[PDB]
Design an enzyme around this catalytic site. Sequence first.
Site, PDB file in Angstrom:
ATOM      1  N   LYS B 109       0.842  -1.190   0.000  1.00  0.00           N
ATOM      2  CA  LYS B 109       0.000   0.000   0.000  1.00  0.00           C
ATOM      3  C   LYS B 109       0.878   1.242   0.000  1.00  0.00           C
ATOM      4  N   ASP B 234      -9.844   4.414  14.346  1.00  0.00           N
ATOM      5  CA  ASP B 234     -10.236   4.431  12.935  1.00  0.00           C
ATOM      6  C   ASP B 234      -9.748   3.204  12.167  1.00  0.00           C
TER       7      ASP B 234
END
Lengths: 313, 302
Positions: B109, B234
């Site tokens: 990523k 989150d």
Amino acid sequence: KVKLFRASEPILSVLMWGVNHTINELSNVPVPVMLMPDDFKAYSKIKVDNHLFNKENLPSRFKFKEYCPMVFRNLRERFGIDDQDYQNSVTRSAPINRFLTTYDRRFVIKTVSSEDVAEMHNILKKYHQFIVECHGNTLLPQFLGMYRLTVDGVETYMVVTRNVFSHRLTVHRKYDLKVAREASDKEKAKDLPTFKDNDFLNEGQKLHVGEESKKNFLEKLKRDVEFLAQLKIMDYSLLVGIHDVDRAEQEEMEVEERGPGEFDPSVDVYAMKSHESSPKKEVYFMAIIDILTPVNPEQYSKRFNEFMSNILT
Amino acid sequence: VKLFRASEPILSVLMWGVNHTINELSNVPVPVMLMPDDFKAYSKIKVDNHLFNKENLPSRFKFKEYCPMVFRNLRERFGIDDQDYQNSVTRSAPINRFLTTYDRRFVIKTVSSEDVAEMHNILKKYHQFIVECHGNTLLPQFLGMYRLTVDGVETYMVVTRNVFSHRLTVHRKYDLKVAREASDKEKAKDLPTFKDNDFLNEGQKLHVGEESKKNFLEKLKRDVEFLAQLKIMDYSLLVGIHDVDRAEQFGPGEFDPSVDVYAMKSHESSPKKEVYFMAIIDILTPPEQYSKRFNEFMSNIL
Ligand SMILES: O=c1[nH]c(=O)c2ncn([C@@H]3O[C@H](COP(=O)(O)OP(=O)(O)OP(=O)(O)O)[C@@H](O)[C@H]3O)c2[nH]1
Ligand SMILES: O=c1[nH]c(=O)c2ncn([C@@H]3O[C@H](COP(=O)(O)OP(=O)(O)O)[C@@H](O)[C@H]3O)c2[nH]1
Ligand SMILES: O=c1[nH]c(=O)c2ncn([C@@H]3O[C@H](COP(=O)(O)OP(=O)(O)O)[C@@H](O)[C@H]3O)c2[nH]1
């Protein structure tokens, strides 16, 4: 399998790391059909800035530049030198002695001027194909690599050649033959002095190789110094090593208390056995050295060829 | 010959960089222990080629690896051999920024400068949690973190072990985390990431039975109590379902647990035969309450 690149000075560690790195990169580069002009103006450059990492032997910051890597790889191949052997000779253990050899004595590493690197670029195309037209059969230096190292913001150029001398046979006497030249009282008083021309003549030294090898030595000497003349090159020498077989047999036996005179021409490419009927059994090593210098180059060719013609029988 | 042929030059540099750094590391001894500086260290190399080896690589580029001793040790603690990792990145170009290696084993990523900062902030405590749980964890398994410079622009990348299997196809995917749901746009992609409320409106359940439910919950609690104790929020739990029967439309529902570490068989008493993959993701952007609420949501799915 672990290469630590441990060396007595950081620049040798960078040398080992650099040859290892560049040879490994080269293994992922296809071998070309032909060299192309850009290969003669090309280079590889790496800049390493490590931080708190891998500092036991390499410096944290250094640069390594290899000149014309495709060309020098092709040269290694044309001289019968495998890339894996070349890297192993440089990296398995630190080179020794500026002038160095690899630990196995196979290759010589000389540091050179920026001017010498210029002159190599200038002669490289014509040198590469003089090598190709003579199939590697030459007494000139066999250039295998050219490098620039940067350690402590200082640049160092190095040229790698095949050793003139054998990598196993001991050299008992050496001469650098090209006015009048001689060895210093200082130089003459050291472990192995480099005797110059006039000490060769005052000694009455002669090298008896017999007719066949005299002839092939002189034929490649004529081709070689006509090449260097046509390239306007001067100040080169013929380096001559004498190996006394019998003395070697003794010295080995002297360390044993606490074949013989045989060698592989594929490896000791400048070596010649003494004639069958010659006073002592000897092995000679003879090559042209110091060819990156630039009174007349044609005159130099002729005079040099006459002298070396006369050191044989 | 590793040509590093790639669909864009940045992937070529990625392949080259992983190849180079892994080879260098094979010449660095494995230490008795990691040291504090290993958590602040980096490797940096800068390549300026000229008329050379330009067929697939750019001539000029930079590659920086963060904490290479630490991430090498993490690779070891996750049971990943270094030359296997290098082969998965270099034998063939990564695919689809979000990438996997050609063999789908590892995820690459692209991340923010801030994410790299945050990874440095957690790295020592994360490594200590990896050692204390023996690699048995549902957290992301970080294998490498790199900064690439191509055309004077920096790109940061983090390599993780894939949550999903590298061979079994995933037929539906959910991202479990107010109220959140999937967009009409996402709902029309080939494999939507259905978010928390579409899992509940779908009524999907994962039947793994009592034995395997129990320490999945134990490891989920350990992990997000760790992330709470590190003030992380989150993050999500990502879940994939593989239906063997559609795959039929050399074995089905077959997998190596040593390779697909997040995979679970469907219980015998489950309507369809399935394989589930479930792990925590997106743990890098910086309360305790989230731990309990998230753990509660995931709690009611067996
Ligand atoms: O006739 C040539 N054709 C070439 O293709 C060529 N390539 C390099 N050189 C030589 O290189 C020497 C110094 O070293 P170098 O120029 O390699 O350093 P550089 O220019 O990369 O960096 P820097 O010294 O500013 O830090 C220069 O004087 C040139 O003799 C060449 N000469
Ligand atoms: O291939 C080689 N194998 C050798 O073993 C060897 N030994 C010396 N040389 C060369 O001879 C001159 C140095 O002679 P030196 O007097 O020892 O040192 P210097 O002349 O710089 O004072 C320079 O051309 C050296 O590169 C050798 N070449
Ligand atoms: O290890 C993994 N293997 C995967 O196969 C995989 N697929 C997605 N993800 C993560 O899920 C979010 C993106 O989901 P998305 O909705 O498809 O894209 P985005 O949310 O950016 O619009 C991000 O955390 C992605 O990195 C995966 N992680």
